[PDB]
Each structure stands twice: as C-alpha cells, then as structure tokens.
Amino acid sequence: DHLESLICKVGEKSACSLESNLEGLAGVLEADLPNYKSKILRLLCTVARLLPEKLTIYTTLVGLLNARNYNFGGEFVEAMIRQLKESLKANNYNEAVYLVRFLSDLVNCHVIAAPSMVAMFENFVSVTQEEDVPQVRRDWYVYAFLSSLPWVGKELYEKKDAEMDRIFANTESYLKRRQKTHVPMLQVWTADKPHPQEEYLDCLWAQIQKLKKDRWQERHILRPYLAFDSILCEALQHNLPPFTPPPHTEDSVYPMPRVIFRMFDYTDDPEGPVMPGSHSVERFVIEENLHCIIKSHWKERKTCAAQLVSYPGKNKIPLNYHIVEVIFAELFQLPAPPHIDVMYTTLLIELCKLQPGSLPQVLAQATEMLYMRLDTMNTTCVDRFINWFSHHLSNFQFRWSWEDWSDCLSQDPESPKPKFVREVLEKCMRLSYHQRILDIVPPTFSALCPSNPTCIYKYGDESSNSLPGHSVALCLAVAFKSKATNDEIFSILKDVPNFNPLKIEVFVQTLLHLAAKSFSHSFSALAKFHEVFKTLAESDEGKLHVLRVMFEVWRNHPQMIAVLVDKMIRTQIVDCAAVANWIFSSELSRDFTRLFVWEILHSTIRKMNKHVLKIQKELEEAKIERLQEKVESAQSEQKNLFLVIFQRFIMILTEHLVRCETDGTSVLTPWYKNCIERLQQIFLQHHQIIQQYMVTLENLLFTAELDPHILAVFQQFCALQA
Amino acid sequence: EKLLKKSCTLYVGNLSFYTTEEQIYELFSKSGDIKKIIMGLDKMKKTACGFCFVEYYSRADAENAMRYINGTRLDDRIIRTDWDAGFKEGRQY
Numbered sequence: 001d002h003l004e005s006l007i008c009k010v011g012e013k014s015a016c017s018l019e020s021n022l023e024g025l026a027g028v029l030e031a032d033l034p035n036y037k038s039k040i041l042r043l044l045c046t047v048a049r050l051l052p053e054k055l056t057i058y059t060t061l062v063g064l065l066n067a068r069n070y071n072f073g074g075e076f077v078e079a080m081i082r083q084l085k086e087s088l089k090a091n092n093y094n095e096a097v098y099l100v101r102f103l104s105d106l107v108n109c110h111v112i113a114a115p116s117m118v119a120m121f122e123n124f125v126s127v128t129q130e131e132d133v134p135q136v137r138r139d140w141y142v143y144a145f146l147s148s149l150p151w152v153g154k155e156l157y158e159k160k161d162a163e164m165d166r167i168f169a170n171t172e173s174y175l176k177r178r179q180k181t182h183v184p185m186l187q188v189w190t191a192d193k194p195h196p197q198e199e200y201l202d203c204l205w206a207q208i209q210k211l212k213k214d215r216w217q218e219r220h221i222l223r224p225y226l227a228f229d230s231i232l233c234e235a236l237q238h239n240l241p242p243f244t245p246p247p248h249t250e251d252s253v254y255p256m257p258r259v260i261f262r263m264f265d266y267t268d269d270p271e272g273p274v275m276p277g278s279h280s281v282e283r284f285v286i287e288e289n290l291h292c293i294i295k296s297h298w299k300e301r302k303t304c305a306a307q308l309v310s311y312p313g314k315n316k317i318p319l320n321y322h323i324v325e326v327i328f329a330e331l332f333q334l335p336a337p338p339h340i341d342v343m344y345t346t347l348l349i350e351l352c353k354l355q356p357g358s359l360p361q362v363l364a365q366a367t368e369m370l371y372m373r374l375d376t377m378n379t380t381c382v383d384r385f386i387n388w389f390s391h392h393l394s395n396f397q398f399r400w401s402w403e404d405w406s407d408c409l410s411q412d413p414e415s416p417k418p419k420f421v422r423e424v425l426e427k428c429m430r431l432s433y434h435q436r437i438l439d440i441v442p443p444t445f446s447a448l449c450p451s452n453p454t455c456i457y458k459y460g461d462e463s464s465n466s467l468p469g470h471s472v473a474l475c476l477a478v479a480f481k482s483k484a485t486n487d488e489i490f491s492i493l494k495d496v497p498n499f500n501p502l503k504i505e506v507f508v509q510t511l512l513h514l515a516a517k518s519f520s521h522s523f524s525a526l527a528k529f530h531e532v533f534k535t536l537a538e539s540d541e542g543k544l545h546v547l548r549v550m551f552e553v554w555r556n557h558p559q560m561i562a563v564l565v566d567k568m569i570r571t572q573i574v575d576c577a578a579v580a581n582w583i584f585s586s587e588l589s590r591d592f593t594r595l596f597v598w599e600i601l602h603s604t605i606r607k608m609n610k611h612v613l614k615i616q617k618e619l620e621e622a623k624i625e626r627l628q629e630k631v632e633s634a635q636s637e638q639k640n641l642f643l644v645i646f647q648r649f650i651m652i653l654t655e656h657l658v659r660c661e662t663d664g665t666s667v668l669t670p671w672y673k674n675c676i677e678r679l680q681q682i683f684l685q686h687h688q689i690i691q692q693y694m695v696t697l698e699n700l701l702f703t704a705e706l707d708p709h710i711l712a713v714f715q716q717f718c719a720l721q722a
Numbered sequence: 723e724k725l726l727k728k729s730c731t732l733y734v735g736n737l738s739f740y741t742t743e744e745q746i747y748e749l750f751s752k753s754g755d756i757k758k759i760i761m762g763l764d765k766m767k768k769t770a771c772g773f774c775f776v777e778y779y780s781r782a783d784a785e786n787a788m789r790y791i792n793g794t795r796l797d798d799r800i801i802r803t804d805w806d807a808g809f810k811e812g813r814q815y
Contacts, residue, residue: 299789300789301789301790340753340786340790341752342752342753342790343786345790346789346790346793346794349794391752394795394796395794395795397798430744430745431745431749431796432797433740518744519743519747519759520743559748566755606755607755
C-alpha cells in the first residue's frame, strides 16, 4: 500500500524537482524488487493505462528502473504486452490506446527498440486488410498507430524510414477508401467556416503529415527522460514479443467514430502565446491531455479545475483558451458527453474563481462565438448550450450584454438565434421569477421573454354557462372543495352528456384548476383521485384525452406539464406510448419544436429504459419463471415505444416533404431542421438500445424506398458501428 | 454514518425565503430524477424558513447533486446540500 502511494503521487507538488523525485523513486522501487516485484509490475501496468496524462513521467520511471535492472524491464515489457492483449479482449479499446502509447514512448526512453514498434504498427495497419470486419475495427488500429506518433514519430523515422513510408502508404490508401456516412450525424456544426468540423482520422492524418513535413519536430510534449540522456541508452533496449491483433468476433465492440470539435485559432487570442494550429500535433496532444485530466478528476470539481490550470508544457500556450475549448468539446460531443452535463457548468464556475482576471473574458468571448455560429449548430448541441448558458447566467445575477445579439430580433422566430434566446429566457425564468427575467433584457427583447405561467380554466368566471358540461363542472368544483370522495365524483360525472370525452374534460379541467397553486397540490390531487384517472383513462383514447386536456389547461406552464406527465407515467395513469403519440398530435403542433416537448419525450423514454434495467437486474439476481416473462414483456413495451416514435417521425416528415413538393417550396425550413435533428437525437441518445431493433427497423420502417432525407438519418446511425 | 451512505435524500440549506418548490425542481433535476421535494415552513405562519429536502430515486443522482449543485447559486444565494438520513413527519418546520 506504501508503494502504490509513492507511484500514484509521483510528479505532483513538491520542493524537489521531478528529475530528483524520479531518480529517487527509481532506487526505492529497485530495493523493493526482491519482495515486491510482482506488485511493482502491477502498479506500473496500472498507471500506464489509468494515468495517460502522466505518460512521459512514468515511461521515464520505467526507463530509470530498467537501467538498474535489465531483467525487470524485460518482465515489465512482457507484462505490458499481456495487458494490451487482455484490454483488447475485454473490448477496452480506449485503455488499449494508452498502453500502445506507453510502449511507444518507451522507445524514446530506450527501453524498447524502435523496430519492435515499427513491427507492431505494421501489424496494426494490416488490420485494414482483414475482410468482412467493421470499419470501426480497422479505424481503431489505425488510430492507435497514428495517435502514438507525436511521441515516437521521430525515433521511428530515423531508425526505419523506408519501413515507415511503406506503412504510411498503406495507411493513406485505407483512409482514402473509408466511408464518411457518419460525419453529418456527429458534427456540432455543418458549416465549413470559420472552422471545419473534421472527421477524427482525416484530421489526425493531416496532423501527422505536417509533423512529417516539419521533420518530426514538435514543441509541446514534456520529455523528462531527456534529462537522463547519459543514463538511458540503446544498450538497455528490449525486443518485443510478437503481437497479433485479436481477430474480430461476435462479442467485439469497437469505439464509435468521432468528429473533432473546433472553435478557436490564434487570431482569437492576439495578446497571448501563439495558439498551435488545427493541423499541428501539438493541438492534438494538448486537448488529448486536457480531456484525460478531466476524465481522472471529473468527480472533484475543485481538483479538476486546479489540474487543468496547472497543465505543463515545453513551450507557452494560451491554456485558458485550450481549457474552454476542451470543455465545450466534451459538452457538445455527439452522441453524448463523456460525463454528466451539469458537471461542465460547475467546472467553468470553479475555473472562473481560480482565474478571475482572465478566464471570464475568454468564456465571454467563446459564448459570443457560439451564438454567432448558431445557424448550423446541431439541435442536440443547442439544447445543451441553452441549458448551460441559462444555468451559468443564474450564477452571475443573470447579467449579459443582450444588445450584442440584436441581430436575432429581425429574423424569423423559428430561426436558431431568436429561438435560442427565447429558450434561454424560458430556462432562466424556471430558476427565477417572471417579472425578474422580463427585467434582465433590454426593451427591444421584451417580446422574446416567456409568457406568465398562468393556469387556463375553461369553466371559470368568464366562460358561458352554454358550454357542454358547464353545470356538471360547477358541481365538481364544490365537490372537490368539500373534500368529496372518488365515489362522489364518479356519481357527479354521470351527469355528463356524451369513452366519454366530456367526462374527462370536466374532471381534468376542474381538478387541475383547483390545485393550480403548486406542484405539491397538483401531485396530491393526482393521488387523491387516482382511481378516477385510471378509470377514465383505461383505454388508449382516454390516456390521450387526459394528456390533451391537461395541455389545454397548462400550456403556459411547460414545467408543470413535464412534472404532471412524469407523475402520470409513474402512477400508471397513462403509458409511454400514449405520451409518444400525444407528442406528435395536432394539439401540440405549434409547440412541437420547443425544448420542453423533447425533454418530456426523452424523460419518458428514460423511465421505460430504467424500468427494463430494473427487471433485468432482478431476474439477474434470482438466477424465476415469473420474471423471465416479465422481462420480455417490458422489453416488448420498450421496443414498441421506439417503433411508434420512429413511425410518427416518418409520418410527419413525409407529410412535410409531400407538402413542399406539392407547393414547390424548399424542404429546408427551420421547422424541418428541428424535426430531422430531433429524429437524429433519438438515435444518438439511445443508440445502444436501438441497435437491437436493426432487423425490424430495416424491414418495416427505414426501408430502401423511404425518401432519402429520412433514410439517411438511419444510414448515419448504422455507420456508428459499421 | 452507515445510514448517510445509502440515502438518496439531501437536506438543502441557506435557501432564500422567496425560493419555491418549482425552482428547486428545475435546479436539482439537473443531476437526476427527483422523487419528492418537501419545503421547510414556519411552524406558525406556514411560511418558508430557508431549507428543504430533496429525495432522488437513485443514489447516483443524489451524489451528482452533492458534487455539482452543492455550493452553487439559487436566487443569488450560495446553497448547501448535506446527506440526510431521511425525512420524518414534523421536520419540515
């Protein structure tokens, strides 16, 4: 337990220089080899795959230890190759990359001979030759290779230039024939300017090309081992045991393709160090290391902020811009961020407290840039941008220079910019009060503020007694007030003149209007007369009518609608399928593109997903026949929920396309962008579950005949694992 | 201490007197699904006294709230969250 502490904490804060701590730790680990050789090897293999941000610090350690005990270095190198094979077998491709990078950097420490790595990479690149295997398998082996080059590229080209050029030729020809079907579904922005959002392999390749052109010289990576040039030499090299990439199997799961998030360039920071270009390996290494730093500390926001800000480099870089860009790269990553969304919001706040005199200006500059680039930003990313920004604002007294965004005022309200502003003000209001938010904006922006969340009573002091069920509602009003019982209400509802659509309307209208004081009253009301609901909404048509009436009452209070829908699902008043159908109904037609709608849908899908996991976890433990059937029935409702949603999407999209062709108008309207990207979002947020429905989807819904505008979204989804 | 480690309930303090159950839903829902919220009232007037209880359906969601919601603002006041053994009738005053 003592060694683990010395190894894990090496390189942190101290009075002694790193070189001094490394040399010291080296002697400490050697002396303990006779009794803890097996432990030390385990810890070194662990830090190799868990702390990639400290790559060069540990590869230096291994080198100093190898210089004191050649045999130990041999067993370690052998143990590493073992770990790598294991990681690949357990589909831990992400961790495998770190091991490959560690072995690569060990070449610089002269612990591993260059030809061994050149050989390993030839094998990696040959995977691109395997037949009938996923492009994502071939992609990864190429990435493990190319992404290792910033560290060992120079050492390998000077030792095996001819062999290296062969590998590159083969690498290039593979990259030239890769399919890019997935790109449109993963880009944060589709616009080419000001920054192309490049497919990760094309970008990395360009970065390697530039590095090669620059004679394999790079100025960022910290190489501690250079300080021991007299102690680390070729005489201590080891040859690696042959390495065969584990063949493709049915249980093989490979990482999805990625698109490089890009928003800054050196002209955005004229007064700071020159920012490494988009096609330099320095930019790749910086972001890669910052991403790893967050991955290691995301749970501790304070420690995470401190580690990011103290990121060291060989030369000066505009670190604040790199940190902000990396945080937005994670938050806006598609399909999903690596960590829970809210963590990024609090991380930026912690960073602002740590660098009060510089970080806030950068974040402000970045916010302005994100707004200005809204026109082609993907809808899923826009929601996260809306949620982040509104939350951030509530932590700084809702202060913002809205006038800078005055260009949204004269555009079509459905357009990205004005819609963004309205959704943001809506979220702010949810964390504040109506008049308060109405007051944070300039007069010219008052029309974009949300309406007062007031209840709407159809049978109140305004309606005409000439309304169907008027007299009935009147009795229901007093009945509830006198704390009547379900039976009483059941009796009163019989006076309703016609599944009776009016019984539901008078009941829902009256009951909700009376508990319209708070979420609590409404919830308790749903509980008290829960029997009435389950009876009126017994049929699917009834569950849809309850939702329809609930909306007509609370349309000005989206948050109320969301919590009521969630309660009705949990207490089984309505089911997920009814909610899905309600989302695409004509009543909600004018609110279809609004955020709350999609928030309710996804929150509804999540409850179904968690319900499936719950039962699965139970049948798991009890392994009885009464569950194996319950699981397949729940998985049946789950699959059906997704089929209905896809069905409704195909239906409204086809209608839109036929309408446009009929009228000769363009298909690319603001409504369309929103609708097609919301479909895309279904596939993005639940791709793991949806992959189980492939066969069905291909035969019943997303068929070869389907209009290409729609089928493409399905083909892009397919490409994530093709 | 053995209890506080299985709980899905957080005690939230330093809330402004004008903070409502709806604002708390909006803020705390950012870490996960909220099962129930109980506002603290004055034993006499039945008026807010600056605290509430937030119960999540899962432990993981309450932990993320302790990690990212704790120490941030609501109605411009820095709020505090602490693990809680669980709500008991009467403790809402």
